[PDB]
Every structure is written in C-alpha cells, then in structure tokens.
Write a protein that binds this DNA or RNA. Structure first.
Lengths: 305, 423, 94, 329, 325
DNA sequence: AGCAGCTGCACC
C-alpha cells in the first residue's frame, strides 16, 4: 500500500438494484470488495490516459433502502424478487433468489499517481465522474441524476497542497460535504482482542463474531449489555482451497490467460463511524492485499489504529 | 453379520412405503416391487448409482441451480494472519454435505444408517465384519460393493464452472490477476444455522427465558439475534441442491450488516416548537435509546472506572454526532422554513438549522448571521443533556460529577468549535 | 399443549422495564430485543414516554406489560406462538 | 471455430424506477410540485370465488365456506378527488458499445463475433431498432395498465447532455399506436440520437415524463411484488421513498417489445425480444428451437458456419445483444 | 383444450370512492361549495345487551347485567343542523374488452375463450347487461343505508367528454324501483352509452352525483372500516366516504336468474352466487348452474347454456378475478 | 438398416 497525493470525492451516488446479499452469511450492505473493484475498473477505463494510479476508496453511505418484506406471523424477513421468462415450451422458471437494495453512497478514493502537477486542476475529477456514471457499483446501475433542482459536483483536494492548518481546514471543509452519512472502517484488532478475552480454556469456532452481532440481555446480578458504536460482520476477502491452476487448464473458465483458484469467503468486523472522529480523511480507504502464494486475498483499511 | 438384520430391516421399511405411496387398485404393478426392491438387486443398483460426491465446503448449486461445475472437499488452510475467519477451521466439526441426483439419495440414506456410527459406514474404510454382511453369498461381490460404495465418495472429474457460477478478478500487487471462482460453504452455513437454532429454541434458552418472564436470577442468560433474513434456495423441492439444503429447507438464515439509520426515514420541520433540543430531538428515534442508557449509566459504581468512564464518554460522543447529523440532514427539506409568519419565531436555534435562508433573505441575514456568531447553541444543548443525569445525592456529593462535567465540557467545546465555522 | 408460559417465554422480549424515579415503568419494544441501543426501537406514547403504569414491583409491571401484549397486540402473540411451536419441535428433534 | 463456452452481454438502454405523482390536467407547464401517490393498506370483505377442490372433504364444510365471507387486506393506490392526471417519470441511459461481449473463453470467437457485428453496423446501421425503441417510448407502453382507459397521454422526452436539457420532444401517445411502425421527422430525430448513443461515442441521458388523464379519483397501478393465513397482506405494492413506482424490468420489457418477425402469425403484435421469444401473458413460446429461428442457432449459424439469416432475424439477433444475456455451452 | 392453470380477468366498470357532503334542497344546481360531512369520534355509555356466556352466569358475577354502563367509544357521522340533503359524488369508468384475459398459460384455451365471447357479442350484444347497470345507476342503490327513509332521492349523471359535460341525466331514484327493470327513453340512452363503452366504441367516464333528502341533523352512514373502538368510519381527507367496492357491489346487483326461488329480487354477480350477509349461497356447485360449470361447458365442450346463463357468465367476466385450476 | 437429438418419464 502507499499514501495518496490527493483525495477525490465523488458525490452522492444513487444505485438502484445493488446486491444486498454480500456473503453466504451476511445480508445488507454490499461487500467493500465491490467498491475496490469498482475503483480498479475505473482505473482501467480512465486512470491510464491521465496517468493516475487509483487505489483505496471510502464508503460513506448516505442512505440505504432494502427491498425486503416481513411476513405476517414471523419475526424474520424475506426478499422481494423479480420474475423470469419461460424456459422452452411455456412454463414458469425456477426462481433465483437475488436481494436488491437501493443505495446512496458517496465515495472518496485515493489519487496517487503523477498525472496532476498544475495544469489539469479540476478536469481529472470531472472526467472520473463522467466515466463513473456509465458503470455499476454492486451489480446495479448508477442513477443518471436528471435535472431536478441543482447538481452535485466532484472534488479533488491535495493533502500536500498547503500547510498544516491548510490541511486541517481543507479536511474540515471536505468532511462537511459527506456529513449525513456513516463511514465504514475495518476492525480486525478489536475482534482479536475479543477472541483473546473470550478464550479462557474454551475454544472458539465462530462465536467471536456472532457474539458481537447478537443482542444479549443476560444477567450479572433485566439489563442489556452494550458496546460502543455499531459493529457489523463484513466479508473481508477470500481464502484459497484449490492448488492454483494453469490458464489453459480449467474448463468453463472466464478467460484462459488468468490463473483460477477455488476460494471461500472471510468474515471480519466493521464500524459505521462519523466523518469527523477519524482524525484524518486519508484513512477510511479500502485497499487490497493479495499474498498470492498463500491465498488470503483480503481487503481492509490499513493505517487506522 | 449382526449388520445383516439391520440391513434387511431397511429394505422392508423402504418397500412398504413404496407400496403404500402408490394408491393401488389395478394393473398388478407391485410384483416388481417384490422382485427388485426386496432382494439384493437393490444393492447392485445402489452400487451402480452415482452422482454423489461427499463434499464439505464447496457447492455450486446455490448459485443458479442449472450450473454444473466442480464441487470440492477440502478445509481451507489455517491462516496465521489474525483478524478474521471464513471457515470452520476450529472445533464443532463438519457435517459432510453431499450433492447429487435426487433419486440417488436413498443410497446415502443407507450409508448414513447409524449402526454404531455413520462416519465408519459412509467412509467405510475400516470395516471387518460388515463385508460379508454386504453380501452373504460370496466374498468377491462383497468387496466389489464395498469399493463401489467407498470409492465414489471421493472423486472429482474435472474443474469447471458452467458459465453461470461466479469468477471475479483480483488485482495482484505488482501487476496481474487471479480468477478467483468462489463456492458456497454449506458445512459452515450448516454450523452457523445450528448455533443460531441452539441459542433460541434450545433447552438453556427456554430455561433462562422463563426466569426473565418472572424477574429472577438463574445460572446464566440468553441472546436474541435480531434482523435475520431467509433466502430459500430450493423452490419447491430442496433435494435437487443438497441433502443439507433439505435438512435446513430453504433457510439460509443470514445475519444483518445494515447501516445504523436504515429503517429511520422521517421528514419533518420544527416550525411549531420554539426549542429544538428539548422537543423533536428526544422525539427522534435513535436519541431516546442513547439518553435512556445514559440515565442507566449515570447511576452506577465507580470502582471499575477505566471501562465505564470510556463507555460514558463514547455515549455522549454519539449524542453530539447525532446532533450534528440532524442539522446536516435538515438541509434537504427546503432552503428556508422560517420566512413564513409563525407563532413561534425561534430564530436562536433556527439560524443553525436554516443556512440557505441567508441566501434568500440576503439583506439582513447576510450581516446578522455573520455578525452575531451563534455559539451559545451548544449551551442550550448542555441544559438538555443535564437532564440525562439521575437526581441522586450520592453521585452528586462525590467528585465523579466533576469528571462528568469535565468530559461533557470538553466534548461540548469540540461541538462549539465545529459550530463556529459554519458560515 | 402449549401453555401461556411457553408463549410468554418468547413474548417477553417485546417489553422493556425501566426503573424511574417513582417506580418501574414499562413499554413495548417493536424489534423484540428488550429495547436495546443499536438494534432495537421502543415505541413512545404521546409528553413523551413509555406506555406503562408506574408499578412499584417489577413483577407487577412485567405482568401488566405481558397482559397488555396478550390483550391488545395479537400479532406479537402470533409471532410468540409461531416461535413456541418450534421451541418444542426442536426438543422433539433433539 | 468452436463455440465460446461462456458468453455474456451487459444491458444497454438502461431504464429506471418511474415515480408517479398526481395532479390536474392543463397544469402540465408548471408540473414540478406535484404530490406523489402513496400506497395504502385497506381491508376488504368478499366472497369465496375460487373454484373448490372436492377431495377428502365433506360438502357441508365447503358449503359453509362459500356462505361465509372472505376477509383480506390488500394494498391500493388511487389519485385524490382533485387530481385526474397521473405523471410517470423515469430516466433512460443509453450506454454504447452494443456488440462487444463482457465474457468470452476464446479469442477466435470474440474476433469473429466483432467482425460480424462490424459488418452489421456497416451495412445496416441502428435505424430499424432505434426507430422501434423510439416508437416504444413514443407510445406509453411503460404505463401498462394506466393506458387501457386513459383518454389522452402526453409524453415529453428531454435530452440532458451535460447538466441541462438540449432538445425536447412532445408526443401524443395514442395516435402512435401499439401496433404500427411509421416514420415521422421528430421520431427519426430521436432514433438518430439513440443510434448515436448505441455506437460507443457517448452514453446519452433521456428523461421521460408521461401525463395520463385517467379519471377524477380513479385507480392507478404500480407494480406488484413477488413474495413466494390471518392478518397477512395478499397484495403488496411497490413504493420507493414513500412514492408509488413501477419496476425497471417492467419498463424494460415495455420498451423492448419490438419483435414483429416470428414464424407463427406475426400480425398479432410486437412481442418481447427474448431467446425462445416468449410472452408470459400468453404462455406461448414463439421462436421455438424445433423451428430454426431461435437466437442461439441463428447466432452460431451466423458466426461459426458463415451462413446468414435474412435482414429481420439478424435485427432480432442484434437486438438480443443490445438487451443482454448469459449464454454458453 | 383443458382449462388453464392461470386465468386472470381485469375489472371493467371501475368506480371511485364516493365522497359525502351536505347542504339544503333547492340548491342542488349550485352544489359545488358544499361542506364535507366529518366523522366525529364520540363516547357512549350503554348497558349489556348481549347474551350471557357460560362463565358470566355465576351468582356473584351476575352483576354484569346489573352494574355495567359498558363505556364504549365509536365513530358517528351526522348532518349539520340547517342542512337536510346529503350529496354523494363519484366517478365511474367503463373500459371495454370484456372477454380478453390478462394472464394465461394455454393459448389454445385462450383462442377458444375469445371465440366463445365473440360468438356471444355477435349474437347477444351488451344490451341487457348495460340496461341493468344503467338501472342500478338510475336509482341510488349506491346509497346503501342512506336511501332507506329519504323523502326525495335524485341522481344526476354527467358525461365527461374532454373535461366538461357532454350529456346530463336527471333521474328520480324513488320512481324507479329497486327490484324491477323497467323501460325509459333516457335510461335507454344511458344504456346505449354504457354498451358503447363496454363494447369498445368509445371511452366512457361518467360523473354520478346523488342527493338524498334525509332531514336536519340526522345520522348519515359512510362505510365502516374492516380491522384485522370497534367502530371506525371511513374518510379520505377529513371527509366521510363510501368505499368503491360497495359502490361497485351496488351496480353489480343485476342477477335475476338463479336456481333458487328468484321471485325475491336481484343479487350480486358472484361465482357460487353468495349473499354472505343473508348466510345463503345460491348457485351452489351441486346443481349445475354456477359459473365454473357453465364456463367449462361453453368453452371446452361447446355446450352452450341458456341465454340468461350466458348473460350471467359475461357479467362474471366483466367483474373479473382469478379463474383456473 | 445404423447414429444423434429430443421428449416423456421415474424418483426424491
């Protein structure tokens, strides 16, 4: 990973049908790996012509509306589906369960390369905003934002462009532009602390995460025990099962010039903070970390704590 | 050879149900049910019947059920990097999922016939007396049927993902990509669902809920697991996907990763009430459980101060966070909601809540909003937050109230500092 | 053979019992978690506050909450009965 | 040489959820402050009108059932008593890069496929298909059930280029019927814009509003959800941000019904563009694979055996590539 | 040839929620600014008028009939004290396309059904059904409990052609009875217009207003809400209203052909034609005269029933619903 | 008079 030379703020992005299913176990907000893959794809489309390497992305989540329904007579929830066409003779197909959610999230990503010196001072942000619109973020199209009252412009702020009080003033002015939302950060050390204090001659299997995910009203002589903040299980990358295959070896591949690996998910913690208690907006940025010989294709926010 | 009586029981209990679920009145069809499904030609066809694989954490049928790729049996390698967990690389061992044809699952039901354990019978590598129980006529076809049963439960074929499974690129550090085709971890989704079923419908939860209905003590407590969701893989018959998808019919039992404010849509303007901290702030949906927990926490013991003072400080930090977000989201209603003639003027708090009103009334508000410096609006907030304390002389007499005033004054100083540069 | 206490096992989590300066007020919780901070939402009666009488003892306020749940809000009792059937079906399994 | 084992095409002509509001006619000039219609759960008392299954029962129980009322709770949404005009608004994003796939195993199949789509767009540009899509937007085919009794529908389409409009079109949706495909000047201009947007140079933004004069306080219909016995809502209506709306797939199927070349009495009407072209309202799957006119056999007869269908079936194949899909053997 | 698993039919003759206002007689012409009848919640103090249960008949608990004011709270809608005329206004849209389903799984059954309905409309047009719908408009059966003692009821029907009136009918609901279908010239003109709308030769949206002269201060009856207080009246925008399904049930009472002793009166059109408020279901499936047997004999087996049964079948198709396996 | 595709069917 590396440190950004500038931060690019894409404003309030509206996604119509995102993938609310983010794991084999967690539903709700999409995986942040979708956002990191979006910024990598946006680097492949528009980052090469400007000579900018685009890594690290923030997630602020202005609003979230999941297309779910609670059935009358049950506590749990089910998904509102869409209907599929007929197969071959006239017959209703087998329905595939896909969760959909309307999202509004603005992004802050890390401009890192050597493409801005003094001349294209604001054109880089506008070109990245005009290329981000005709793409997808979690499987759903980004809304075009037709004319209602007034648009929402892009932003490009250079953290090296100014003194220390200029850094704090520009960070305070930027962090007010994403204020109705909640930033998502990754907390691996906190989950390891909970595993340390919990494992007192009793072994864990997965209870360290489902115990922070539940709400217990247990009694210590009711009372309901509480935590600071909102701690949600999020899919933190993949893990390897298969010894890796040659590009032209596995049949029914997506392409025969990239090696295939059968992978499983991973699960870690995440917190939904405010934009004004992180002490640096150069954090919140979600990066990859491969280590390809072992597996552990992970994504996380480094340099946080 | 004591397995043989247990064997000939099961074929009879199968064939009786096959005769009963036919509604027979004519056509003399039952004779073949006496011919094949009573003798051991059933065993020859059970040796013939394949499609089953005995997987653990790899199914491709939950992702678009008309897709035939590769299904695996391997626990993932134990990671040394701390912070996460993705499989059951620990205790509470696997449940041995099997994917195959739905007509062939009677063979697995015969393998899992728990004659002193189904692990030494489904993976029957260590059998000594069971061989002649499989065929009490010879020793050749007995070994043949043993090899045909235990050999087909570990076989692969070829790696595939039949154009409807998922496979997504992963950017490498320097340059390059890996293809990264994932699978559904049915043993892990079985184990999580079994824990969530044990925490609610179990005996311990039934015992410890009866004590709470009666306000008691008891050895221990319990949990709730809110906002679960159901994702039903099989449409009407779940036997096509997996046997574990039939034991947990549909029933993915997913856990919530939602934002905090997700089910909190409300659009209102405080045109009626004068003071906005006392009214419509406590009437907000999320602030009430912060304030009531603060009243619950501001009357307690101060012996273990290192954790409870941190929790008491973070619970006030969240309150001023929601206080700033309220003014942040009230700028989406209208540029001005105070220019109309109203019974309550309330400009002292509405100068904070109507910033674009100065863009409309650019004559007097442009001088007055930048000449008056509204920074006592946090002092009005502190008078509302002082009612979150309990009226007890024991906490009022000690010095911990000075500590509470110290942390509240620090966080309100940060609040006033943020509110000063609002122009 | 599902008694009222078996339904009352799973009906109890929709109420909350707050000790106040005079006594033990009670209220109704929508999410069925006991009125927690992060996951729950407790309905407030219109003055804003809990919809409960100020009972002296906690057993009295708990019985008042649970009797009002059985009397007025029958969908919560239906959810509690749908949980209580599986609560003994799970014992019938294992 | 051999067929590509995977094949995928992303969806172009992207629709959106269409918000619905209410308001009076002859106020369509300042029709920007209209209140949106909301969904309302009302409870109804009816009769047992479903046909009975007389199996393992007695006639007394089913007779006492059909003598007893049926108590349901449904969700409806109607205009107010001072509003007879429904306003349906959505956004269309015509992307570009029509015949470029998004997944391919082989380089040979991708090369030959881009060659045949190149010869298509050279020898016959997007002129029939763009006119058909612009006609499907010209009539209010997206207003599915709100058009069966509307007296007049006025459709305004605005072209938003950078931050504002640049071209307005105003159609009467009942003169341009649901079956005829004629040629007008403004419709050919809109087809030229959609044709320029489908070729990769830009992704064009259209905003469509539709005024339908339904009736004073009558019933409007948003789309129903697919959820797979006392106090349960039988009919649930779609509403996003507390405003009633139609799905995106319904609007996509509405402005995608342009296929008028199918081998079993094609004069009944335009049907949806689909592999094994199916109308779920009719239950009958035209373009049967027993006949030689499905999308799959025509596509691999075009790109692997170098034969060619007529001018119409390759228009159908290109329209299926515009729609999108997941294929592969 | 067999019956489809899914068969859906859309509702023609769609009315609106009928809204109520109040004023004086001889101001029927300028009755545009009339004030809306408001539902008021009141509390009453009664007695115990129900029969005692097996548990409440004890000697020490017989006080329920003795000492119980019973303390109820209900909703009530009344007229203002200087107004004796109640005005009920709604709009009625008639669509056309009576026999075309909106969903089907077998198109051979669909072509058979379309051929059968076209055979009907070619032989027997929409002359009886439109006459019966027009007679259910011409008397105010839409005013359900608001007609049972009124001194003078007058209905007025306007044709909304573009935005304004094209034709005005002014009928006396007390001269036209509630149990016989007679003849009149203006009623026949309204029947021709309704038949032209139902056949598909035009778009018909009518404005139906109805004045019932109850008297000053009297109790008017809007629709009562079904709750899945115990008395909640229906109101849209703080004005008491009748539901559109009750108004549509008032115009669906056209069935004077059923297997019972049909010298009593017309009933509503239902499959297994049911008056659940009277507890008896005529057109039982045991006698071969319900909608499903006639529809499966007319379409599948080409066994055409009598012309009155064809009228009832086409009326049940106009009502719409879910028919199928 | 012998192959490959299709369709109905059996079972859970």
């Amino acid at each position: 990973v590396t440190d950004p030379e500038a931060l690019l703020l894409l404003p309030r992005l509206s996604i119509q049908n995102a993938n609310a299913i983010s794991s084999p176990l967690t539903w709700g907000f999409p995986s942040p790996g979708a956002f990191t893959g979006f910024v990598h794809a946006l680097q492949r489309r528009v980052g090469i012509s400007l000579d900018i390497e685009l890594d690290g992305v923030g997630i602020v989540c202005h609003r979230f509306e999941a297309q779910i329904s609670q059935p009358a007579g049950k506590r749990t929830k089910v998904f509102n589906l869409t209907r599929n066409p007929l197969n071959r003779d006239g017959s209703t197909a087998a329905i595939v369960e896909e969760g959909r959610a309307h999202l509004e999230v603005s992004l802050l990503l890390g401009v890192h390369g050597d493409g801005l010196d003094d001349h294209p001072a604001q054109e880089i942000a506008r070109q990245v905003q005009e290329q981000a619109g005709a793409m997808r973020l979690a499987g759903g199209s980004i809304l075009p934002w037709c004319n209602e009252r007034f648009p929402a412009p892009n932003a490009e702020l250079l953290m090296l462009g100014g003194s220390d009080e200029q850094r704090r003033k520009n960070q305070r002015r930027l962090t007010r532009r994403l204020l109705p939302g909640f930033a998502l950060v990754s907390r691996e050390a906190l989950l390891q602390q909970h595993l340390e204090t919990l494992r007192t001659t009793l072994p864990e299997a997965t209870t360290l995460d489902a115990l922070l995910d539940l709400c217990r009203i247990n009694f210590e002589p009711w009372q309901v025990r509480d935590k600071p903040g909102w701690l949600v299980p999020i899919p933190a990358g993949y893990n390897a099962l298969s010894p890796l295959y040659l590009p032209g070896e596995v049949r029914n591949a997506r392409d025969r010039e990239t090696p295939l690996r059968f992978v499983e998910n991973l699960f870690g913690l995440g917190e939904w903070l405010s934009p004004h208690r992180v002490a640096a907006l150069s954090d919140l940025l979600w990066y990859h970390h491969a280590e390809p010989d072992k597996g552990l294709y992970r994504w996380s926010t480094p340099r946080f704590v | 050879q004591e397995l043989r009586q247990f064997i000939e029981s099961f074929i009879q209990e199968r064939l009786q149900g096959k005769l009963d679920k036919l509604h027979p009145d004519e056509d003399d069809k039952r004779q073949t049910l006496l011919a094949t499904h009573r003798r051991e030609a059933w065993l020859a066809d059970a040796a013939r019947r394949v499609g089953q694989l005995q997987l653990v954490t790899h199914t491709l049928k939950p992702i678009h059920p008309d897709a035939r790729g590769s299904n695996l049996h391997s626990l993932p390698q134990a990671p040394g990097q701390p912070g996460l967990a993705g499989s059951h690389e620990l205790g509470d061992r696997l449940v041995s999922d099997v994917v195959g044809n739905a007509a062939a699952l009677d063979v697995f039901k015969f393998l899992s016939l728990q004659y002193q354990g189904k692990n030494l019978l489904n993976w029957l590598t260590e059998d000594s007396a069971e061989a002649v129980q499989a065929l009490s006529d010879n020793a050749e076809q007995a070994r043949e049927w043993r090899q045909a049963f235990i050999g087909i439960t570990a076989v692969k074929g070829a790696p595939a993902s039949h154009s409807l499974a998922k496979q997504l690129y992963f950017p490498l550090p320097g340059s390059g990509y890996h293809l990264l085709a994932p699978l559904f971890p049915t043993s892990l989704v079985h184990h999580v669902h079994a824990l969530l079923r044990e925490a609610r419908f179990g005996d311990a939860a039934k015992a410890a809920r009866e004590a709470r209905s009666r306000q008691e003590s008891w050895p221990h407590g319990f949990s709730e697991y809110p906002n679960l969701a159901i994702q039903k893989f099989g449409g009407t018959k779940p036997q096509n996907i997996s046997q574990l998808n039939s034991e947990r019919y549909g029933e993915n039992w997913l856990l919530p990763s939602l934002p905090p404010h997700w089910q909190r849509q409300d659009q209102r303007a405080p045109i009626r009430h004068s003071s906005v901290f006392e009214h419509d702030f406590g009437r907000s949906p999320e602030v009430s459980r912060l304030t009531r927990t603060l009243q619950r926490l501001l009357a307690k013991t101060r012996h273990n101060n290192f954790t409870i003072r941190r929790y008491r400080a973070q619970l006030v930090g969240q309150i001023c966070d929601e206080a700033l977000q309220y003014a942040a989201r009230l700028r989406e209603l209208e540029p001005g909601w105070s220019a109309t003639p109203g019974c309550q003027l309330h400009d002292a708090e509405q100068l904070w809540l109507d910033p674009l009103r100065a863009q409309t009334d650019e004559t007097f508000l442009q001088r007055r909003l930048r000449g008056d410096w509204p920074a006592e609006v946090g002092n009005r907030f502190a008078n509302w937050l002082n009612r979150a304390v309990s009226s007890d002389s024991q906490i009022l007499g000690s010095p911990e109230a000075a500590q509470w005033s110290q942390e509240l004054s620090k966080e309100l100083t940060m609040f006033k500092e943020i509110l000063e540069d609002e122009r | 053979t599902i008694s009222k206490t078996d339904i009352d096992c799973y009906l109890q989590t929709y109420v909350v019992i707050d000790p106040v300066s005079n006594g033990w007020q009670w209220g109704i919780d929508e999410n069925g978690v006991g009125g927690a901070l992060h996951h729950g939402r407790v309905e407030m009666v219109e003055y804003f506050g809990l919809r409960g009488a100020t009972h002296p003892t906690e057993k009295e306020a708990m019985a008042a909450a649970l009797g009002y749940l059985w009397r007025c809000r029958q969908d919560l009792v239906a959810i509690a009965r749908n949980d209580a059937i599986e609560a003994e079906k799970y014992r019938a399994k294992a | 040489l051999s067929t590509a084992s995977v094949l995928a095409f992303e969806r172009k002509l992207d629709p959106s959820d269409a918000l619905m509001s209410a308001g009076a006619w002859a106020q369509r000039d300042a029709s920007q402050e209209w209140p949106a219609v909301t969904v309302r759960e009302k409870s109804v008392r009816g009769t047992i009108s479903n046909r009975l299954k007389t199996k393992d029962r007695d006639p007394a129980k089913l007779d006492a059932s059909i003598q007893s009322p049926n108590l349901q709770t449904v969700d409806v949404a109607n205009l107010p008593s001072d509003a007879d005009t429904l306003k349906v608004r959505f956004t269309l994003r015509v992307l570009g890069g029509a015949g470029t796939p998004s997944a391919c195993n082989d380089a040979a199949y991708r090369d030959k496929l881009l060659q045949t789509v190149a010869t298509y767009v050279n020898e016959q540009g997007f002129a029939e298909l763009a006119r058909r899509y612009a006609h499907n937007l010209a009539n209010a085919r997206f207003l599915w059930r709100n058009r069966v009794g509307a007296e007049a529908v006025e459709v305004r389409i605005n072209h938003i280029r950078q931050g504002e409009v640049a071209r307005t079109w105003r159609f009467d949706a009942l003169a341009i019927g649901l079956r005829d495909f004629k040629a007008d000047a403004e419709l050919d201009a809109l087809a030229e814009l959609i044709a320029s947007g489908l070729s990769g140079s830009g992704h064009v933004l259209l905003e469509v509003v539709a005024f339908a004069r339904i009736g004073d306080g009558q019933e409007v219909f948003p789309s129903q959800e697919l959820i797979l016995k006392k106090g349960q809502k039988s009919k649930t209506l779609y509403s996003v941000r507390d405003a009633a709306a139609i799905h995106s797939q319904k609007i996509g199927n509405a402005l995608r019904t342009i296929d008028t070349w199918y081998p079993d009495e094609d004069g009944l009407g335009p049907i949806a563009v689909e592999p094994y072209g199916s109308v779920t309202s009719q239950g009958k799957a035209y373009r049967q694979p027993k006949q030689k006119l499905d999308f799959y056999t025509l596509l691999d007869n075009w790109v692997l055996r170098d034969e060619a269908p007529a001018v119409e079936q390759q228009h159908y194949v290109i329209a299926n590539l515009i729609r999108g899909g997941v294929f592969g053997e």
